[PDB]
Amino acid sequence: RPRFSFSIAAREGKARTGTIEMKRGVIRTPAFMPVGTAATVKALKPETVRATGADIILGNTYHLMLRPGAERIAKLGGLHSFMGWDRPILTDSGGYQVMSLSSLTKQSEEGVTFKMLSPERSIEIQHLLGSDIVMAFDECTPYPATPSRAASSMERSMRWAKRSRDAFDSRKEQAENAALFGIQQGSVFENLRQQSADALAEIGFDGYAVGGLAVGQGQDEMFRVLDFSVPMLPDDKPHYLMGVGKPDDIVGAVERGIDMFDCVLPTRSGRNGQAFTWDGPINIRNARFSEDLKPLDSECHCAVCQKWSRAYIHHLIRAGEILGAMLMTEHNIAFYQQLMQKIRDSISEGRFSQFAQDFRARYFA
Amino acid sequence: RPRFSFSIAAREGKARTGTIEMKRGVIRTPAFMPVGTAATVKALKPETVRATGADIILGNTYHLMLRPGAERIAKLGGLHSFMGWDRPILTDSGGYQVMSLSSLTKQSEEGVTFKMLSPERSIEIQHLLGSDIVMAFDECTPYPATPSRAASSMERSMRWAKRSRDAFDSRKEQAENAALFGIQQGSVFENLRQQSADALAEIGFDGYAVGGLAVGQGQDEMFRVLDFSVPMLPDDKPHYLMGVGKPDDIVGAVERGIDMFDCVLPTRSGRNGQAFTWDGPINIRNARFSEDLKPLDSECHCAVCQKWSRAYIHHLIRAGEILGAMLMTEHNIAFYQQLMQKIRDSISEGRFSQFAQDFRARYFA
Ligand SMILES: [Zn+2]
Ligand SMILES: [Zn+2]
Questions:
Q1: Binding residues for Zn(2+), per the UniProt record (chains A, B)?
Q2: More exposed terminus of chain B, fewer Cβ within 10 Å: N or C?
C-alpha cells in the first residue's frame, strides 16, 4: 500500500463513496471513527472494535501526552503496539482538550501553555505516538464568535497550519509514512470559511477537516455552514467533519460532501444508557424495558443483539455493572458502522437520497 | 447426561480428580467457580468466562432476589437464558449476604427477615432462577464463636438442611433436573463438625460443602479444620469449600480432599489491580510496571498475556479505564483455571504432592 491514496468510486449529488489506502490498511468512506481516549476505545477490546466494522480509530493526544506520555509510548513501541490496534489511527492535535480540560491556560502566537503545546510539539507528539493521520494544530473558535474574533482565530490557525505542514515535512519517517490533514476554521461566516479553505489549499494537505462546527451549533446551522463550506475544499481529497455526530447529523453531512466522522456519542452515551436504533434512540434504563426480551434493535447484526435482551442490559446498566457498559458500547459502535455501510452501499447504488429520506422518516417517527 | 453423577478417576493421598456430569454439562474436578454477582461475572462476557476454561459459575442469589427479582428472571426464561451462560450454575442460598449486606435483620427458627428468606423460600428462589446446583439454606456462624453458639447455629442449620431437602424434593422439576448440596457447620470444633457431617449424611445430599471457613480464619487454622472435617463427609460425593480462596489455599485444600471452590478474589482483586502469577501476586499499579513490556505472567496461556503488556494494563488501571478491569479479570480467572488444570493433571499422573511443593516454593519465593 501507498502512504496515502484517496479514490472516489461513486457519487450522488455532493455525496461520495470510496477508499483511503494507507500503509496500515484501507479505510472505507464515508467513515466513522470510534474515539479512543487514553489509548482505549472505552469498554472495548480492539478486536471488538474491528468486529463492528471500524477501519480506523481516533486517538485523543491530550490525555496521552499527560499519561502515559508520548515519549513513553514511543519507547514502548508506539500507540498501535501499546493498545493492540494495528490498523490506521487518526490523532487529534490536542488543542481542543488543552483548552477545555486544562488549567491556567496561556495562549500566544507560539502555542498554548497549560497545567507548551505548539504546532511543532503537537506534530512531534503525533509522531511519537505513531499516528497514521496527523492533524494540524489549530485554535477551535468558540460558538458564537464575533466576526472579528473568528477572523483573528482563523488567521492564527492558518499560520499554525503552515507551521504544522513544515514540522511534518521536516521529519522524514513521518512524511513518508503518515498523512497530514488541515483544518478549516472561520466559525459560521462564509467569507472566513473561504479564506480558510484557500489558505489550506495553497499549503496543501492530504485531507481537509471542517473544524469548529461541534461546539454548540444546532443542526440547522451546522448544515447551513456545510452547504457553503464543503464545496470550498479540494474535491479530490477527503473531507473530515470533526466531532459530529448523531446518526441524523451524519446522514445530512454526507449529503453535503463529508467523508469522515468522529464523535464520542456512541461510546459515552452507551455507558449512560442510551442505545441507537433505526427507530431512534432509546434509554435502556427506562422501566418499560425491564421485561422486554427483544434485542436493543430489531435488525442490528451485532453480537449483542444476537445474544442478549433489552431486559438484561436494562438490569446491568441500572446495577452499574461493567458488562452493561461493554454491551451498550459494542452495540452502539456496531450501529454506527452499519449506518456507514448503508450509506456507502446506497451511494454506490445511486439511491442515497432515497435512503436518507427513508432513514429520517423512521428514525424520527 | 444424567441429572447428577460424580465419578472419581484418580486419587493421590486425600486428593481426587474426576467429573460431575449434569444435564447442562460436565464439570472437571477439582473445580474453580467464577462468581457471578447480579447475573454477571464482573467485566466478562460469558463466552470469555468459558474461554478461560470454567465449566460452572456461581450465581449469588441475594442480589438477584432483590434485583431483578427471582420471579422476574423466571418469567424472562431463567438465569441461564437471561445472562447467556448455558452450562451449570451453582446458586448460593442467599443467607450469608442477607446477614452481611442487609439492614435490620431479624433471625428466627422460621428464617431471616431483612431490609422473609426461609429455607423453603431460598430453595424456591434457586428454582425460579433455574439453578443446576442448589445450596441448602443455613446459618454461617461468625468466627470466632464460642462452642455453645457454634453448636446452636449448627443445630439450626441441620434443621434447615432437612427443610431444604424436603422443599427441593417436593418440586418435581427441581428434583429431577437439579442437584442439592448440604453444608457442614460447627465452626472450628471437631465434635460439632462431626455431628454436622452425620446429620447431613443421614438426610442425604448430592454433595457436601464445608461451610464457615472463609470468615476470618487464617490459613493454618482453616487447614487444621479441614484435616479432620473433610474425612467426615461421604467419600463418594463432591466436597465444596465455600469462599476459598487464594491460589495457595486452593492447593492445600485439594491436598485435604476438596473438589470444588468459589471466591471473589480473582474478579474483585483484578479490578483493584492485583494480578496472579506463578511467582506470586503483583500489584500492577506499582510504578515498576510503567514500562514493563512483559505479559502479566510469563507462562500464562490467556488471551490477555498473548496480546497486552504490563505497561498497558498499568496505564489502564491507573486511568480508571474499563478495559483495565476487563483484562485484569480475564487474566486472573484464566490463571485460576490453569491452576485447576495443573492440579487435575498432576493428580491424574500421581505427582500432585510434588506439584504442590513446587508451586509453593515458587509462588512464595
Ligand atoms: Zn446491536
Ligand atoms: Zn494471562
A1: 300, 302, 305, 331
A2: C
Q: How far is the CA of A53 from the centre of ligand 1 (A)?
A: 13
Selected catalytic residue, list B55, B92, B206, B249:
B92
- Residue B263, annotated ligand binder? no
**Under a CB-based contact definition with an 8 Å cutoff, are residues B296 and B282 in contact?**
yes
Q: Of A328, A277, A254, A360, which Cα lies nearest the Cα of A31?
A: A254
φ and ψ of A167, to 5 deg: -65, -45
**B325 in A contact zone (CB under 8 Å):** yes
Does the beta-carbon distance from B43 to A322 stay under 8 Å?
yes
Q: Could you tell me which residues come within 8 angstroms of residue B112 by beta carbon, excluding any fewer than 6 positions away?
A: B95, B98, B99, B105, B106, B118
State the smallest CA–CA distance between residue A90 and chain B in angstroms.
Answer: 20
For residue B152, give the amino acid letter. S
Tell me the C-alpha distance between B225 and B189, whole Å. 8
CB contact under 8 A, A323 and B68: no
Find out whether B220 and B249 touch, Cβ atoms under 8 Å. Answer: no
Q: How many CB atoms sit inside 10 A of residue A221's CB?
A: 14
Q: Name the residue among A291, A316, A325 with its Cβ closest to that of B72.
A: A291
- DSSP of B254-278: HHTT--EEE-SIIIIIHHTTEE--T
Q: At which residue does the C-alpha cell 476505545 appear? A: A41
- The C-alpha of A35 sits at a distance from chain B's nearest C-alpha, in angstroms, of 14
> Which method was used?
X-ray
- Nearest CA to B258 among B18, B3, B2? B18
Residue ranges of the domains in chain B? 1-365
The reply to whether B169 belongs to the active site is no
A185 assigned binding-site residue: yes
Distance (Å) from the alpha carbon of A313 to chain B's nearest alpha carbon? 9
If one counts every other C-beta atom within 10 angstroms of the C-beta of residue B203, the result is 16
Q: Between helices B352-363 and B247-255, what is the axis angle to 10°?
A: 160
Cell 430489531 found at: A298
Distance between terminal CA atoms of chain B? 44
> Distance between CA atoms of A183 and A185, rounded to whole angstroms?
6
Answer yes or no: are the C-beta atoms of A96 and A46 closer than 8 Å: no
Q: For residue B218, how many other CB atoms are within 10 A of its CB?
A: 8
The Cα–Cα gap between B179 and B131 comes to 9
C-beta atoms of A323 and B82 within 8 A:
no
Q: Is A42 on the interface with B (CB under 8 A)?
A: yes
Q: Which residue type is seen at A242?
A: M
Other beta carbons less than 10 A from residue B49's beta carbon? 23
Helix (H), strand (E) at residue A184: strand A179-184
Query: How many Cβ atoms from other residues are within 10 Å of residue B1's Cβ?
Result: 10
Q: Rounded to whole angstroms, how far apart are CA atoms A314 and A316?
A: 6
